[PDB]
Amino acid sequence: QAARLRRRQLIRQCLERDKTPLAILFMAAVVGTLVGLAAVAFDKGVAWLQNQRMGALVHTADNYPLLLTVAFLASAVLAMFGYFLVRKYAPEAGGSGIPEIEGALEDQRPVRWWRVLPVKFFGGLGTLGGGMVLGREGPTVQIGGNIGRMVLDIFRLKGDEARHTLLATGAAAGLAAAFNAPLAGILFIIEEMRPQFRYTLISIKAVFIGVIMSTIMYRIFNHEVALIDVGKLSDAPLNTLWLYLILGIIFGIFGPIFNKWVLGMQDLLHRVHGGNITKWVLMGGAIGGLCGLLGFVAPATSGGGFNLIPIATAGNFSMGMLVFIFVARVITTLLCFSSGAPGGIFAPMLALGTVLGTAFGMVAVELFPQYHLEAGTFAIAGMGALLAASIRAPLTGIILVLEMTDNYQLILPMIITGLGATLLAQFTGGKPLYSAILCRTLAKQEAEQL
Amino acid sequence: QAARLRRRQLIRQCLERDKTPLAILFMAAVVGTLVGLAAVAFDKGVAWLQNQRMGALVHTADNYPLLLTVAFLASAVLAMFGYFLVRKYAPEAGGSGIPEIEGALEDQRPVRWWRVLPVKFFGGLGTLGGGMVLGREGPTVQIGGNIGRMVLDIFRLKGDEARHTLLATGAAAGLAAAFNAPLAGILFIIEEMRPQFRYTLISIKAVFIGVIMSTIMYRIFNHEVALIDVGKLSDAPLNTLWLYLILGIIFGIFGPIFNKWVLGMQDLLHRVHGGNITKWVLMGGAIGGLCGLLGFVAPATSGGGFNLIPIATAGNFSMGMLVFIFVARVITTLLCFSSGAPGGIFAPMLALGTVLGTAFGMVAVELFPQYHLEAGTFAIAGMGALLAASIRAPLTGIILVLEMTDNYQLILPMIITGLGATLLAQFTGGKPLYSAILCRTLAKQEAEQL
Numbered sequence A, B: 001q002a003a004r005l006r007r008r009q010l011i012r013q014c015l016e017r018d019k020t021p022l023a024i025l026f027m028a029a030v031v032g033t034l035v036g037l038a039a040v041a042f043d044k045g046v047a048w049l050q051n052q053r054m055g056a057l058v059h060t061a062d063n064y065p066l067l068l069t070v071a072f073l074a075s076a077v078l079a080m081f082g083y084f085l086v087r088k089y090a091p092e093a094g095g096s097g098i099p100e101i102e103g104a105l106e107d108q109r110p111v112r113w114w115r116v117l118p119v120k121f122f123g124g125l126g127t128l129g130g131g132m133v134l135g136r137e138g139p140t141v142q143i144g145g146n147i148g149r150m151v152l153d154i155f156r157l158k159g160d161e162a163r164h165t166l167l168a169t170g171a172a173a174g175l176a177a178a179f180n181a182p183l184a185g186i187l188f189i190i191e192e193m194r195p196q197f198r199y200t201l202i203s204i205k206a207v208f209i210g211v212i213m214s215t216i217m218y219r220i221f222n223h224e225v226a227l228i229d230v231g232k233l234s235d236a237p238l239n240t241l242w243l244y245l246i247l248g249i250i251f252g253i254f255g256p257i258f259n260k261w262v263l264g265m266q267d268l269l270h271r272v273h274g275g276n277i278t279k280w281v282l283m284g285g286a287i288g289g290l291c292g293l294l295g296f297v298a299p300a301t302s303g304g305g306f307n308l309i310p311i312a313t314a315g316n317f318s319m320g321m322l323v324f325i326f327v328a329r330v331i332t333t334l335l336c337f338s339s340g341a342p343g344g345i346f347a348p349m350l351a352l353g354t355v356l357g358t359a360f361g362m363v364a365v366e367l368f369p370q371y372h373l374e375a376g377t378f379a380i381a382g383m384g385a386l387l388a389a390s391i392r393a394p395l396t397g398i399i400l401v402l403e404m405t406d407n408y409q410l411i412l413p414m415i416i417t418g419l420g421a422t423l424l425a426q427f428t429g430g431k432p433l434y435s436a437i438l439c440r441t442l443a444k445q446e447a448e449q450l
């Protein structure tokens, strides 16, 4: 009868009248509007700082050593301002911000929106606007989760189930308004933050509301159907689907290796400054100045990565250039993200999977000419395979790539590529990167409390 | 210290090796291949019986009262075969089968694959091949979930984690191998089966493997890219997005009203036979013969519904014809599903949401000519709005409709329509239908135990 009283517990759940608090559902539309407006202002300010930087690199065009100095120095001072705001005011605004938000969903990290929200905005503005190899995905999730706490504090909402609802609403609205991906922002919460999020009928409807309001706030100011404008690539036949499983196996081995390089470079770059702010800022200007220098000479090795993925998905880079771009963008991704700059690793990971997927597709075309393959259809499957192998959230990584590229005929090749990425990353001993960063944040704050 | 002790449990959970045995993942490839093969033997056995029934109406087309007798009696004898196998050999194979698989993941229902799997197959060929208003999701999910228990019992695998993994693998594979929707099969388990499924890192990977192997087995025998071949419809502009909220608000009221009509007709049709097998079989041949009669005279009011959706989305019907189809298909959906026939309600719900959404999309083009609306974008948004209001799985129902229609420019209108459907079905006191059918089975089982 151990299942009999369990069955009587099941019938006691059906006759419950599930109430509908419309107060938290209205604030989720206030959150999602404010997240989507702060996401648009972040993207328009990062792009304005990037167009002002290349506008300074064309007025000094005939003078080449002066151009390389003002490519370094305009990106160094822009990065030094971002490192200074994090180190002086909000140290939890360094890095991505997803481990700070999913640590807040466990009631383990504080949400200091009076400090993080001006520092993650303006410090990430000069960091990403300076041309560093960092994405706006992580900043927008942390700006979103801090806006949802701000709305909870301004309107004085009490209760701990409303606190986790509005914090997850803005993190869902942050992903939905960074990438024009309303489907991935919902799957950000129920698939990637699955151990963190408390699934209530109200809390998942509020995640839907904030995602809707932040996608509408995005599309008012951006009228393109694809964030990454690759074309309409070919279908994948059934006799070519095993090549996407092999491509996932290669990504699923590299994924844990890349995660050990992220945490290993976090430790190695911390020995340079030792926690000192005036050496953390000057190391951040040397890293930020290099990526603005690399933004002029060999610009495929620097930047967030979205200006490389449509070039690499088409057959424009050779096999020797994709090897150079991959090694250089592995070095500058670890140099930017693991140094504690405000900026995520998600959009640099898309450029690393596109280049590694195009390299796989170019070998697959020359090895199998009987399949009529494309190099670009493996770049899409490789894009969400490094998020499956390192971030270890394949479903919100697949959906995000299909929404950014508008290529939904590759759903089954991406699930095949994302399975072998997740299967071999668990097998080879890999953890999620945002979990591994948060577990090192939690073990550090357990050590200063001794 | 209350959170410091919880911080210690979040650190030691992070240092664990994650224990990947490949034996249950290979068995998911065996399950997914067998589910995907049994789904195309079900889809091509139902379609063969519907071709022999239409072919019997062309041979003797000169005699019209014999033609209405042959159309009645070919479907009456076929449905009587389906109602008899349920009432004699496997009474839990009646209805959809998703409440029986959902109760099996809760360890409340037995999985008798030696009885259900021949009865759900050959009784499903009788009811669906007779032209009754019943879908093939529920049959294939229950055939799928019983294959996952059959593979567990043949290979004699031990464990309660392995039993719930392979049972949810085939239920996911049953939705992937029907409708060519691998993405909706995964979301069937982590979103619709959220209180039932025990999420593990390996139990979601085995759900991926069975979904992959069943979508491949479907696509070996089926080469259409979309099942519901509506065209490439228009995209919805931002000034028209509030009409999809009103379409969701209307569906979110009707959803609970349609749910109590399903449960009310289950009690009403049970008053006819009282559980007697002879009166249940004769009532089911009367209902099944009525839908084979209606398959010849006014064929839009019977059948599974996949023939009606491309005609309705194209704007081929009138307004009074669209009102007559909605009323008459509601009566035949309540007659077929609530009488205990092997066959689901999901694909009859897509035909009801398309017809009700087209009628909304025709009022919207009459009232707002300045919006430049197409009536078919509300047919697709309304298609998954009855799944969000009655089945109350909005993310599963959006992705399924998108994967069946290949219209992914309507992601955000379907999320707005599915939000207003879910929010108004919870506000007006509606439950999920499969959770309400199972709970009426579980409360009936407690009543047998006095």
Ligand SMILES: [Cl-]
Pocket (backbone or CB within 6 Å): A094, A095, A096, A097, A098, A099, A437
């Ligand atoms: Cl970080």
Ligand SMILES: [Cl-]
Pocket (backbone or CB within 6 Å): A134, A135, A136, A137, A138, A343, A344, A345, A346, A347, A348
């Ligand atoms: Cl990022």
Ligand SMILES: [Cl-]
Pocket (backbone or CB within 6 Å): A096, A097, A098, A137, A138, A139, A343, A344, A345, A346, A347
């Ligand atoms: Cl990130």
Ligand SMILES: [Cl-]
Pocket (backbone or CB within 6 Å): B094, B095, B096, B097, B099, B437
């Ligand atoms: Cl049922």
Ligand SMILES: [Cl-]
Pocket (backbone or CB within 6 Å): B134, B135, B136, B137, B138, B139, B343, B344, B345, B346, B347, B348
């Ligand atoms: Cl169905």
Ligand SMILES: [Cl-]
Pocket (backbone or CB within 6 Å): B096, B097, B098, B135, B137, B138, B139, B343, B344, B345, B346
């Ligand atoms: Cl069903």
